[PDB]
Design an enzyme around this catalytic site. Sequence first.
Site, short mmCIF file in Angstrom:
data_model
loop_
_atom_site.label_atom_id
_atom_site.label_comp_id
_atom_site.label_asym_id
_atom_site.label_seq_id
_atom_site.Cartn_x
_atom_site.Cartn_y
_atom_site.Cartn_z
N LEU B 77 27.96 65.05 27.83
CA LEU B 77 29.39 65.05 27.72
C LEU B 77 29.96 63.64 27.86
N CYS B 81 32.58 57.23 24.35
CA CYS B 81 32.89 56.28 25.41
C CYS B 81 31.67 55.78 26.21
N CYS B 86 33.64 52.49 24.70
CA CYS B 86 34.25 51.67 25.77
C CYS B 86 33.26 51.11 26.78
N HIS B 136 25.77 59.12 31.42
CA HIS B 136 25.61 60.49 30.86
C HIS B 136 25.33 61.50 31.94
N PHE B 500 49.21 37.23 47.28
CA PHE B 500 48.88 35.89 46.78
C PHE B 500 47.40 35.58 47.12
C1 LIG Z 1 33.83 50.11 20.14
C2 LIG Z 1 34.96 50.89 20.76
C3 LIG Z 1 35.45 50.45 21.98
C4 LIG Z 1 36.49 51.15 22.58
N1 LIG Z 1 36.99 50.70 23.81
C5 LIG Z 1 38.02 51.39 24.43
C6 LIG Z 1 38.53 50.95 25.65
O1 LIG Z 1 38.08 49.95 26.23
N2 LIG Z 1 39.57 51.66 26.24
C7 LIG Z 1 40.08 52.79 25.63
O2 LIG Z 1 41.00 53.39 26.16
N3 LIG Z 1 39.58 53.22 24.41
C8 LIG Z 1 38.56 52.53 23.80
N4 LIG Z 1 38.05 52.98 22.59
C9 LIG Z 1 38.64 54.22 21.96
C10 LIG Z 1 38.02 55.47 22.63
O3 LIG Z 1 36.61 55.48 22.51
C11 LIG Z 1 38.49 56.75 21.93
O4 LIG Z 1 39.91 56.79 21.88
C12 LIG Z 1 37.96 58.02 22.62
O5 LIG Z 1 36.56 57.96 22.81
C13 LIG Z 1 38.28 59.24 21.78
O6 LIG Z 1 37.87 60.40 22.45
P1 LIG Z 1 37.64 61.74 21.60
O7 LIG Z 1 37.39 62.85 22.59
O8 LIG Z 1 38.86 62.00 20.76
O9 LIG Z 1 36.34 61.50 20.67
P2 LIG Z 1 34.81 61.12 21.10
O10 LIG Z 1 34.64 60.42 22.40
O11 LIG Z 1 34.10 60.45 19.97
O12 LIG Z 1 34.15 62.60 21.22
C14 LIG Z 1 33.92 63.34 20.03
C15 LIG Z 1 32.83 64.36 20.34
O13 LIG Z 1 32.79 65.31 19.29
C16 LIG Z 1 31.44 65.64 19.06
N5 LIG Z 1 31.26 66.24 17.73
C17 LIG Z 1 31.61 65.75 16.50
N6 LIG Z 1 31.25 66.67 15.57
C18 LIG Z 1 30.70 67.74 16.20
C19 LIG Z 1 30.19 68.96 15.75
N7 LIG Z 1 30.62 69.44 14.59
N8 LIG Z 1 29.69 69.85 16.68
C20 LIG Z 1 29.72 69.59 18.03
N9 LIG Z 1 30.24 68.39 18.47
C21 LIG Z 1 30.72 67.49 17.56
C22 LIG Z 1 30.69 64.33 19.22
O14 LIG Z 1 29.35 64.56 19.58
C23 LIG Z 1 31.46 63.69 20.35
O15 LIG Z 1 30.85 63.96 21.58
C24 LIG Z 1 37.01 52.29 21.97
C25 LIG Z 1 36.50 52.74 20.72
C26 LIG Z 1 35.48 52.02 20.13
C27 LIG Z 1 34.93 52.48 18.79
C1 LIG Z 2 42.64 29.71 55.42
C2 LIG Z 2 43.89 30.51 55.13
C3 LIG Z 2 43.89 31.31 53.99
C4 LIG Z 2 45.03 32.07 53.70
N1 LIG Z 2 45.01 32.90 52.59
C5 LIG Z 2 46.14 33.63 52.25
C6 LIG Z 2 46.11 34.45 51.14
O1 LIG Z 2 45.09 34.47 50.46
N2 LIG Z 2 47.22 35.21 50.83
C7 LIG Z 2 48.36 35.15 51.64
O2 LIG Z 2 49.38 35.79 51.38
N3 LIG Z 2 48.38 34.32 52.73
C8 LIG Z 2 47.26 33.58 53.06
N4 LIG Z 2 47.27 32.75 54.18
C9 LIG Z 2 48.50 32.67 55.04
C10 LIG Z 2 49.48 31.65 54.39
O3 LIG Z 2 48.83 30.41 54.12
C11 LIG Z 2 50.64 31.39 55.34
O4 LIG Z 2 51.15 32.62 55.84
C12 LIG Z 2 51.78 30.56 54.74
O5 LIG Z 2 51.31 29.34 54.14
C13 LIG Z 2 52.87 30.26 55.76
O6 LIG Z 2 53.89 29.52 55.09
P1 LIG Z 2 54.89 28.64 55.96
O7 LIG Z 2 55.99 28.07 55.12
O8 LIG Z 2 55.39 29.46 57.09
O9 LIG Z 2 54.05 27.48 56.67
P2 LIG Z 2 53.22 26.28 55.99
O10 LIG Z 2 52.55 26.58 54.68
O11 LIG Z 2 52.23 25.91 57.06
O12 LIG Z 2 54.35 25.17 55.81
C14 LIG Z 2 54.85 24.45 56.92
C15 LIG Z 2 55.33 23.08 56.45
O13 LIG Z 2 55.99 22.49 57.56
C16 LIG Z 2 55.74 21.09 57.55
N5 LIG Z 2 55.96 20.52 58.88
C17 LIG Z 2 55.39 20.89 60.07
N6 LIG Z 2 55.91 20.11 61.03
C18 LIG Z 2 56.79 19.23 60.47
C19 LIG Z 2 57.60 18.20 60.98
N7 LIG Z 2 57.43 17.71 62.20
N8 LIG Z 2 58.42 17.49 60.13
C20 LIG Z 2 58.45 17.78 58.79
N9 LIG Z 2 57.65 18.79 58.30
C21 LIG Z 2 56.85 19.50 59.13
C22 LIG Z 2 54.29 20.97 57.09
O14 LIG Z 2 54.09 19.69 56.51
C23 LIG Z 2 54.18 22.13 56.09
O15 LIG Z 2 54.31 21.70 54.76
C24 LIG Z 2 46.15 32.01 54.51
C25 LIG Z 2 46.16 31.19 55.66
C26 LIG Z 2 45.02 30.42 55.94
C27 LIG Z 2 45.04 29.57 57.17
C1 LIG Z 3 50.96 25.94 42.75
C2 LIG Z 3 51.07 26.96 43.84
O1 LIG Z 3 51.51 28.08 43.64
C3 LIG Z 3 50.54 26.48 45.18
S1 LIG Z 3 50.48 27.59 46.54
C4 LIG Z 3 52.09 28.33 46.64
C5 LIG Z 3 53.10 27.35 47.24
S2 LIG Z 3 54.65 28.04 47.18
O2 LIG Z 3 55.02 28.35 45.80
O3 LIG Z 3 54.65 29.24 48.04
O4 LIG Z 3 55.62 27.15 47.84
O1 LIG Z 4 36.60 60.36 29.54
S1 LIG Z 4 35.26 60.72 30.02
O2 LIG Z 4 35.23 60.79 31.50
O3 LIG Z 4 34.85 62.01 29.39
C1 LIG Z 4 34.14 59.58 29.55
C2 LIG Z 4 34.38 58.28 30.32
S2 LIG Z 4 33.05 57.14 29.84
#
Ligand SMILES: Cc1cc2nc3c(=O)[nH]c(=O)nc-3n(C[C@H](O)[C@H](O)[C@H](O)COP(=O)(O)OP(=O)(O)OC[C@H]3O[C@@H](n4cnc5c(N)ncnc54)[C@H](O)[C@@H]3O)c2cc1C
Ligand SMILES: Cc1cc2nc3c(=O)[nH]c(=O)nc-3n(C[C@H](O)[C@H](O)[C@H](O)COP(=O)(O)OP(=O)(O)OC[C@H]3O[C@@H](n4cnc5c(N)ncnc54)[C@H](O)[C@@H]3O)c2cc1C
Ligand SMILES: CC(=O)CSCCS(=O)(=O)O
Ligand SMILES: O=S(=O)(O)CCS
Lengths: 522, 522
Positions: B77, B81, B86, B136, B500
């Site tokens: 079945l 896909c 897909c 499958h 972020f």
């Molecule tokens: C290369 C490719 C990539 C794709 N990638 C994506 C994607 O990334 N995301 C996405 O959303 N869509 C994608 N699609 C589209 C997606 O595959 C189709 O929209 C979806 O599979 C259609 O489902 P269906 O049930 O209508 O047909 P199908 O999945 O083809 O099922 C038809 C079934 O009918 C059966 N059948 C046919 N004749 C008979 C018979 N007379 N007796 C018994 N059984 C029979 C077949 O055996 C088959 O199992 C892609 C399509 C292609 C070609």
């Molecule tokens: C390692 C690490 C990874 C993180 N990853 C993520 C993440 O992936 N996603 C997420 O949402 N958050 C993440 N965070 C949290 C995020 O970085 C902080 O919450 C955020 O940067 C706080 O912003 P802020 O403006 O409060 O402080 P800051 O970014 O620290 O800015 C403070 C500013 O004040 C200035 N300053 C300080 N003292 C003075 C002064 N005396 N005079 C003038 N300027 C001063 C500094 O120069 C600095 O530019 C991470 C934190 C760390 C430590």
């Molecule tokens: C380029 C960039 O987004 C650096 S990290 C975010 C800094 S800010 O936009 O939160 O001030």
């Molecule tokens: O949509 S179906 O779950 O039948 C097939 C996904 S590969």
Amino acid sequence: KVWNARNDHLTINQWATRIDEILEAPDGGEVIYNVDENDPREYDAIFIGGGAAGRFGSAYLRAMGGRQLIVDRWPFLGGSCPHNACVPHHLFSDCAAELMLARTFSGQYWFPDMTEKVVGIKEVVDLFRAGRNGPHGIMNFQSKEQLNLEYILNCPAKVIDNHTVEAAGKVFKAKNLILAVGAGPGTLDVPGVNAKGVFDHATLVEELDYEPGSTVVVVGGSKTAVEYGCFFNATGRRTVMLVRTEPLKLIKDNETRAYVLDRMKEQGMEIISGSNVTRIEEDANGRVQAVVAMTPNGEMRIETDFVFLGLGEQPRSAELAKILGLDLGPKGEVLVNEYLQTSVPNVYAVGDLIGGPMEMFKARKSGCYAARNVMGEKISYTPKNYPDFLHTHYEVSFLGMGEEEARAAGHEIVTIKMPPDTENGLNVALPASDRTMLYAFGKGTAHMSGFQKIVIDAKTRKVLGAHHVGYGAKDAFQYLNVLIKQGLTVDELGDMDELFLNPTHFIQLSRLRAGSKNLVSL
Amino acid sequence: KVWNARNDHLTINQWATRIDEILEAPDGGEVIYNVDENDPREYDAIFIGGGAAGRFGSAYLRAMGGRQLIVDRWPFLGGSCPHNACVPHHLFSDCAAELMLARTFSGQYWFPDMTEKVVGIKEVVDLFRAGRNGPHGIMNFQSKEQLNLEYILNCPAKVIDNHTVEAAGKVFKAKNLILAVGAGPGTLDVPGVNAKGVFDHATLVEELDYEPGSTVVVVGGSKTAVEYGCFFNATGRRTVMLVRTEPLKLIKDNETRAYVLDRMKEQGMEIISGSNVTRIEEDANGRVQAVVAMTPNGEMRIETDFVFLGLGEQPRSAELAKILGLDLGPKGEVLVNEYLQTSVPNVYAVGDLIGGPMEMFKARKSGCYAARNVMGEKISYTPKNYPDFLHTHYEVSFLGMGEEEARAAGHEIVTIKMPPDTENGLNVALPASDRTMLYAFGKGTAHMSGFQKIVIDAKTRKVLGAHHVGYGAKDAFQYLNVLIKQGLTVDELGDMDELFLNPTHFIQLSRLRAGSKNLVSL
Ligand SMILES: Cc1cc2nc3c(=O)[nH]c(=O)nc-3n(C[C@H](O)[C@H](O)[C@H](O)COP(=O)(O)OP(=O)(O)OC[C@H]3O[C@@H](n4cnc5c(N)ncnc54)[C@H](O)[C@@H]3O)c2cc1C
Ligand SMILES: Cc1cc2nc3c(=O)[nH]c(=O)nc-3n(C[C@H](O)[C@H](O)[C@H](O)COP(=O)(O)OP(=O)(O)OC[C@H]3O[C@@H](n4cnc5c(N)ncnc54)[C@H](O)[C@@H]3O)c2cc1C
Ligand SMILES: CC(=O)CSCCS(=O)(=O)O
Ligand SMILES: O=S(=O)(O)CCS
Ligand SMILES: NC(=O)c1ccc[n+]([C@@H]2O[C@H](COP(=O)([O-])OP(=O)(O)OC[C@H]3O[C@@H](n4cnc5c(N)ncnc54)[C@H](OP(=O)(O)O)[C@@H]3O)[C@@H](O)[C@H]2O)c1
Ligand SMILES: NC(=O)c1ccc[n+]([C@@H]2O[C@H](COP(=O)([O-])OP(=O)(O)OC[C@H]3O[C@@H](n4cnc5c(N)ncnc54)[C@H](OP(=O)(O)O)[C@@H]3O)[C@@H](O)[C@H]2O)c1
Ligand SMILES: [Mg+2]
Ligand SMILES: [Mg+2]
């Protein structure tokens, strides 16, 4: 030395070059002074700091027609994020993920033999150092030329009082201050903590002048510790995480947390719970040579020349609290009300300065809400029910309730998950989508294709939580969270248009079960 | 031989193994007979085909408490896909993205030297072939054991009338038929099309018994052609696409389409517009040796031993429409009304058989909607305003209106995008997030970090369109589209909690502009 930059118009790439020059100047470099000297209006707010909070706050204030000034001691805007926090964190996590792929398929297809391959940590850190001025350049450019911000950079602010700030040798008045200076890396109080070879996220990208040996010790057990630790491990290094309580408590779903921890252990990471460093041993050269720690199984000694601290961040409140008389909380966070107002009249505090959650959404949003309040729009901010994520060698995304949590809260629940709970367990070619296809099809790698789950109330049919381990779902969680907060049911979820093959399979799996009045898990 | 499988309970992996035996059985193998011999209800619907539409249609009908039978000529079945559509497409696209990364960073960090490296197309197809019985397996397992379905597999269905089908030597009766036999690959009427070395998506995974040489010709210029073509090119082969009109007309936003096409050509793809194959040349052994084509500049000949056809898929309507007298449309699609009903009483059609869009959401939903209609629940289904995606070496995601489209349509608009329009163009370190960090940071690779844009009505403030090139946004577009359909504004976008660094920067970039009553592009 003050550079009057108001009427210069550097490009993004010119800004990147100039920032690099100022950062590298032996004298400390010129002040960047970008102030409209012909505008007679008073400042509505001076922002102390122009990181995420100060920069977004200023952007919003200015968009509302108010006047702002940022002062920042860095020669760039954006704060910790581009310079030493989220940006390098994501570069290292990209490496960790690709490295796991490469190591899993070592000696297959285009993949190099990784068996004896240790990747230089310093090499990757240097790549970050070489490229970090790109995002710096965009921040200075976007801020000045598109957002119309006034700023003074490469200048420590000197707050005089609640209306008065000195920068670039000039005294500025404002109606309000918005305090936005963030937080600094947490440390340990043990002998040896100041030894060379001990790093945190900030010092890693400034001071790594050698290539670490074969063993890395990480202290901490949440996002930073686990993010950097998976990268260190992915480079080929024995990685030991010393976790004070339990690792990854942020992952509330027990099955999701277990999958993630299990995959980390499969990659060779050693994660030690209930453990506290008691000493960092130095060699006669003054570099770490071992970490000594107490664990639930007695003292352990780990030989290493590279220790990474991923503890919390400490609000930078001391100086400002002394000057202004700000009330502080137990961890030194500046206390605010729900309008971001401190105990001091006309002084707001935002970002990491006000404590957890320390995230970019919290920072930027608190900045903007303080800015709205300053502009006369009474608006509260209390971060609550936000989605969340972290990296291991996979992306890990979660929102709402874990399965256990939902039951303890009194909910009758069903779940929809992948892969199904069967005798073949994880060893099946689902879930699968972009960047998990090789795991799904590879010999014995199918267990690595990911894990995911939604938690559903069996009666109301509402989606109470979502959980995903894999790649390409993190962005989706931002938008899915909004739908869930609006009241999403399994029926409405099943009714959406999927984009197969999808990182989350929630839509179509919801459709497979929603035809029933009495819901059953899949 | 007819295997009564009803009371056997194979695991996913047992199933995988046993569909193998059947598929590689010299004689065609036994019939898989999963019918409930106790149930006295007449079949509500027999589904001809157990692909996406047939399988999901059955799931939902059964969930609603109705009785269904699937007849499918494959021993599994899920349809095209998992077997040739897909699933293999996503595996090849994963390889294409990973290979572009490896080729870009060749001989840096962990990345080996890709200079003289040709990856085997047959090797990757053989990987797919070796593993597709995984998917499958899950399919037959989940359908029987989890979804409680009845099915007959490895047996073509013989439709007698609008109430009668012959299968497995037996005759079956039903209140309705749901025609779900999909569509077959398009072809060309040129000499040599039947030569050895000419493939489509279906034959590539059955008949590839050699490794293609150094030039590959692809025919077609939409999803399949570009997906497989990028994968062929990523293996290190000169890839020439012959495109009847213009490539990637699905990408309506001009700048977005240009970015996508620019990055394809930078990887070394050749796209010839306005061209039609006139002859596939054969060698003395009846194998392709060249393709001849008419172009806007006259005849051209490309030497090659491997031609891939990525043309339309054609509804399998002929036999069924003769046996039943169904009305067809101009591409041979079975015409249906909004309830999926054909011209013939009690006969419905769904999936690819009813034409475009030929997507999984459409096949599964049309499937479920016909089942609900069969079951008395009158529900209309006209697919419109859905998100969409395709792979090049990037994921490309799109919904709603492009920028030029929206203005021509009489919408006053602003755009929020990344990278900004400046003289540095794409050569800046944004956009950036998971799987684009190396591009963001590498020497001379910053233009590869991606492209994104939202289109916003300046007066209603509603998001009219969204466009993304990079990775990790595809899944989000599912959920984002729903919010846009509910009326999403730039202010609501800006008010969300970003994770972020996010694949879509839409939330925070919206927040930067949302404070003004009069919006300004970013
Ligand atoms: C290369 C490719 C990539 C794709 N990638 C994506 C994607 O990334 N995301 C996405 O959303 N869509 C994608 N699609 C589209 C997606 O595959 C189709 O929209 C979806 O599979 C259609 O489902 P269906 O049930 O209508 O047909 P199908 O999945 O083809 O099922 C038809 C079934 O009918 C059966 N059948 C046919 N004749 C008979 C018979 N007379 N007796 C018994 N059984 C029979 C077949 O055996 C088959 O199992 C892609 C399509 C292609 C070609
Ligand atoms: C390692 C690490 C990874 C993180 N990853 C993520 C993440 O992936 N996603 C997420 O949402 N958050 C993440 N965070 C949290 C995020 O970085 C902080 O919450 C955020 O940067 C706080 O912003 P802020 O403006 O409060 O402080 P800051 O970014 O620290 O800015 C403070 C500013 O004040 C200035 N300053 C300080 N003292 C003075 C002064 N005396 N005079 C003038 N300027 C001063 C500094 O120069 C600095 O530019 C991470 C934190 C760390 C430590
Ligand atoms: C380029 C960039 O987004 C650096 S990290 C975010 C800094 S800010 O936009 O939160 O001030
Ligand atoms: O949509 S179906 O779950 O039948 C097939 C996904 S590969
Ligand atoms: N989005 C991201 O991917 C990302 C990446 C990095 C950082 N961040 C954010 O940055 C913020 C930083 O603050 P936080 O809330 O993480 O702080 P936190 O939760 O208090 O602590 C972080 C970790 O440090 C440990 N720790 C703290 N003090 C310690 C000590 N003295 N000895 C040993 N271990 C100690 C804690 O261990 P125990 O809990 O076991 O005591 C915890 O595992 C977080 O909110 C985080 O979300 C986010
Ligand atoms: N979700 C996915 O990522 C994904 C991936 C692959 C396939 N699919 C689905 O599979 C379906 C396949 O049908 P389709 O929509 O691709 O069909 P289509 O739009 O009719 O044609 C597809 C491509 O084939 C070309 N073509 C058709 N006949 C041709 C001929 N005789 N000579 C030269 N070129 C010819 C078209 O060229 P011109 O336009 O230049 O005439 C077009 O580039 C699609 O609807 C799609 O939804 C989806
Ligand atoms: Mg799996
Ligand atoms: Mg770029």
